Nucleic acid binder design. Structure first.
Ligand code: CA
Length: 579
DNA sequence: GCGATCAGCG
DNA sequence: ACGCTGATCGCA
């Protein structure tokens, strides 16, 4: 019901200098995954290609790698990375319908061409799920069904570029797509394909020593509990703590007794068992997620892990990392932080270089709210978290422990993002009127932040959305809901999203500037990971001293704010040592 | 499949 | 009753 050529060979009219291209990878994880078909729509017509012929044709391969041949795509990072696993470079992507839909409305959840197309009343294409099936029924259909689905996606992309571009322009989002999100997409592709090298012997050795500490703590719990149980069974664990040992019930869940770490810490005066249960969970988390979980996804021949950075998922414009998540590798507890010793450079006498922004979101907040005292504090490079710990625990800067600082950190962001006196008292273990008086005092010193929090909520009520400094957008229909709880959650989104989102815009700008600068200095250094406000690279040890001057400066100059941006940096033999 | 939980980011 | 995530696991 749509006309196209089922092509055998590649012809010159398939290689026009502007086209919609579909390079279909059905597997969710596209690393080293099969390419099942190719479709091209251009001025000359519509074409389906079998990949075993087009990807071995030198004229088609050259066309893919020629940046003057412009391609409109959906999810071009997926195609680019699977092509790299075929030894093929894709260049010239001038429109990515996934990123365009994500900028226009991140809450759509647009996961395929049909879902983006529906945004513009275009419906002559089917959902990917209806063509391939789901779960155990997933299959590549017969070639004519596949060829028509891929051509319909390409024709949809061909039609939808212009209406998407013109709405992006009306939102002031068109330079965000073309100068930020599309260039970042190619940089993520390289990072994911390069991967990160893992010391599997060291990981395996820690997993052995963990399995032995786990058993010990486990017997000390059973003995403290009188009997044995499934320490992972909330039914059983709840029965032990709040019936057998008769500990107080401080919190319930929708299913029963709460056993979260916040509760278990408040019960430590009552019984020694709760601190052993905490230690047990922590050692079990390291074992399942970060030992077994990481060994499960290492590619054995190279000892590399290849994450996928989802660029069109978070409601704020942050990235996320999946399979493995390399953005939540432990760091705070000493036992967990040693996991970072297994992350090593991919070549001998290379090193890991990490740089990160200091207090990025409070600096963004200072700039956006134009708070006099908050701006002045950062013009003095004050460490607000340490300063806040001193104020809370009535100590000196000498006696600010890392746990007090991390505590003050949660208070600093909590207050500006709408923490209540109740919530503050539960976090500090102070009375509820002391928490409220503290909150009033903090807004006495930063009235401009208070004003911004009110202004941004009223602006979200009247506009229907909030924006970031580079014009990312988030719609907030619930901001006018009549239900008090639903409306309150939306108000705190209006306070938080412009700040977190602007901080995501800034570090994405830095990654793009950094790559251009690495290239102009002809350095071998390349990005491996982004962790929200941190960039991790690897480079020959001979480039470290240049990177100590280049990277901080690039990051600090990514944008110009009314306060300076501050960047800390370390390097060494493993990720562990690069802090 | 989902909720509770916990690892990270602010 | 601060916000944004992803992984594991039990299942109330
Ligand atoms: Ca930081």
């Amino acid at each position: 019901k749509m006309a196209f050529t089922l092509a055998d060979r590649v012809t010159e009219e398939m290689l026009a200098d502007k086209a919609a291209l579909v390079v279909e990878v059905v597997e969710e994880n596209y690393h080293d995954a099969p390419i099942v078909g190719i479709a091209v729509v251009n001025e000359h017509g519509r074409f389906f290609l079998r990949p075993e012929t087009a990807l071995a044709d030198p004229q088609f391969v050259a066309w893919l790698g020629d940046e003057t041949k412009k391609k409109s795509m959906f999810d071009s990072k997926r195609a680019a990375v699977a092509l790299k696993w075929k030894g093929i470079e894709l260049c010239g992507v001038s429109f990515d319908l996934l990123l365009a839909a994500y900028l226009l409305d991140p809450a759509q959840g647009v996961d395929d061409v049909a879902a983006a197309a529906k945004m513009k009343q275009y419906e002559a294409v089917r959902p990917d799920e209806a063509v391939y099936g789901k779960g155990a029924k997933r299959a590549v259909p017969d070639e004519p069904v596949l060829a028509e689905h891929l051509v319909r996606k390409a024709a949809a992309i061909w039609e939808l570029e212009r209406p998407f571009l013109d709405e992006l322009r009306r939102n002031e989002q068109d330079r965000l797509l073309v100068e930020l999100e599309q260039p970042l997409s190619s940089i993520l592709a390289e990072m994911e394909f390069a991967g990160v090298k893992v010391d599997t012997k060291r990981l395996e050795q820690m997993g052995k020593e963990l399995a032995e500490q786990l058993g010990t703590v486990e017997q000390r719990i059973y003995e403290l509990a009188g009997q044995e149980f499934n320490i992972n069974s909330p039914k059983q664990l709840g029965v032990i703590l709040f019936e057998k040992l008769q500990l107080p019930v401080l919190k319930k869940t929708k299913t029963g007794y709460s056993t979260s770490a916040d509760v278990l810490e408040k019960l430590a005066p009552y019984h020694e068992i709760v601190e052993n249960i905490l230690h047990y969970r922590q050692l079990g988390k390291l074992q399942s997620t970060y030992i077994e979980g990481l060994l499960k996804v290492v590619r054995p021949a190279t000892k590399k892990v290849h994450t996928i950075f989802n660029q069109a998922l978070t409601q704020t414009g942050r990235l996320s990392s999946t399979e493995p998540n390399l953005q939540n590798i432990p760091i705070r507890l000493e036992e967990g932080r040693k996991i970072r010793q297994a992350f090593v450079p991919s070549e001998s006498d290379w090193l890991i270089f990490a740089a990160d922004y200091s207090q990025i979101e409070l600096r963004v907040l200072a700039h956006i709210a134009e708070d006099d005292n908050l701006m002045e504090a950062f013009r003095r490079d004050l460490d607000i978290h340490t300063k806040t710990a001193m104020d809370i625990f009535q100590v000196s800067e000498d006696e600010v422990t890392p746990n007090m600082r991390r505590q003050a950190k949660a208070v600093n962001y909590g207050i500006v993002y709408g923490i209540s006196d109740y919530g503050l008292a539960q976090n500090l273990n102070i009375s509820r009127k002391e928490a409220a008086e503290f909150i009033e005092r903090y807004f006495e010193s930063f009235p401009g932040v208070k004003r911004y929090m009110e202004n941004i909520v009223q602006e979200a009520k009247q506009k229907g959305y909030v924006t970031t400094l580079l014009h990312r957008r988030r719609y907030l229909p619930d901001i006018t809901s009549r239900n008090f709880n639903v409306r309150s959650f939306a108000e705190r989104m209006a306070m938080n999203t412009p700040i977190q989102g602007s901080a995501a815009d800034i570090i994405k700008k830095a990654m793009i500037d950094l790559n251009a600068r690495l290239k102009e200095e002809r350095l071998q250094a390349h990005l491996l990971l982004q962790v929200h406000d941190e960039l991790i690279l690897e480079a020959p040890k001979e480039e470290m001293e240049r990177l100590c001057r280049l990277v901080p400066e690039v990051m600090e100059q990514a944008v110009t704010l009314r306060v300076p941006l501050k960047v800390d940096y370390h390097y060494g033999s493993t990720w562990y040592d690069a802090k």
